[PDB]
Design a protein around this ligand. Sequence first.
Ligand SMILES: NC(=O)c1ccc[n+]([C@@H]2O[C@H](COP(=O)([O-])OP(=O)(O)OC[C@H]3O[C@@H](n4cnc5c(N)ncnc54)[C@H](OP(=O)(O)O)[C@@H]3O)[C@@H](O)[C@H]2O)c1
Length: 328
Amino acid sequence: SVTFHNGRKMPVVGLGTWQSPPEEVTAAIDVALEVGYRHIDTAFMYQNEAAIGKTLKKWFDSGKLKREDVFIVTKLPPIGNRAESVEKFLTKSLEALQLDYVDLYLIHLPVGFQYKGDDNLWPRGEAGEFLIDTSTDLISLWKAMEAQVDAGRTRSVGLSNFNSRQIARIVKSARIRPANLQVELNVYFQQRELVAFCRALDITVCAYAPIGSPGLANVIKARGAEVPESAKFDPLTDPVVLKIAEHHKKTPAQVLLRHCMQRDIVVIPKSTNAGRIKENFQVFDFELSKAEVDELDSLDKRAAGRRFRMDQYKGLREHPEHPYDEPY
Ligand SMILES: NC(=O)c1ccc[n+]([C@@H]2O[C@H](COP(=O)([O-])OP(=O)(O)OC[C@H]3O[C@@H](n4cnc5c(N)ncnc54)[C@H](OP(=O)(O)O)[C@@H]3O)[C@@H](O)[C@H]2O)c1
């Protein structure tokens, strides 16, 4: 586990739910909690929160799992990056999860979309134009997040896909500092600089896409987008990681997760598969040498790097709070 600055502990392994359709996410969470997962990462924009709630309500009502024993993470949709809309969406998230509180609430994206509808995650105009909110003000938005911990709807609040300057701006204004930053991170994109930046401010880094995102290429092409060349790199096929995997008699995925975890970095591998779910949890048992760490450190591609880029549309790159123009 990793402990936030406010003293709350966060499990270092959680189960990602993007993209886990509700037909699959319910059984996958049943499997995850049987495995030992005590941390679930979801979001309002993933459209699986209601299914998670169904499974959680079963384990809470029936089974021997207490709510204080599980760590629930959801996020504010880019269509709510305005202080006024924050409690609306978290209230909507909570009732789908059927919980009275989440453990961690993140600003999903620095870049806001104009709210053109509650259930309209990707808003368009009279023309096919993509409705972006040029007016995203983070200081104001963050104060609404702070007000959510005071209402007890969330125990901690944090940021996702934010850069240094925007984290620094928020923390220097923060009545309650960010508890967690969730950015893309794996051995091909280790984010050395941003982790050390956050650790200096006692901000814990949760790593999404920790074993690379193999499904993502097919997902980017499913949406109207172009598959980046960094998405053509599989860190589970890399010979370095396979060599280290045989040394420990472990699988590449667990090697990749381990490398993150021993940097005190939370990781949320996403899996529908009941075997692969179990596979990614059996990772608290082995320690990586100081020498295999540096072979894994050599694998880092730093900038680009990113497969989860934010350059699909002109107005999105040109939005004043675009995080990936800065070095980190
Ligand atoms: N902007 C954001 O904040 C953002 C965006 C996207 C995702 N995320 C977070 O990251 C989580 C997903 O991360 P990801 O799925 O992008 O990265 P990833 O988990 O590293 O890639 C997961 C993919 O690899 C497969 N896989 C999972 N465990 C495996 C294993 N042990 N061995 C081999 N293959 C395995 C899965 O296939 P099966 O499903 O068939 O197992 C899935 O397609 C999401 O739930 C979300 O919480 C955050």
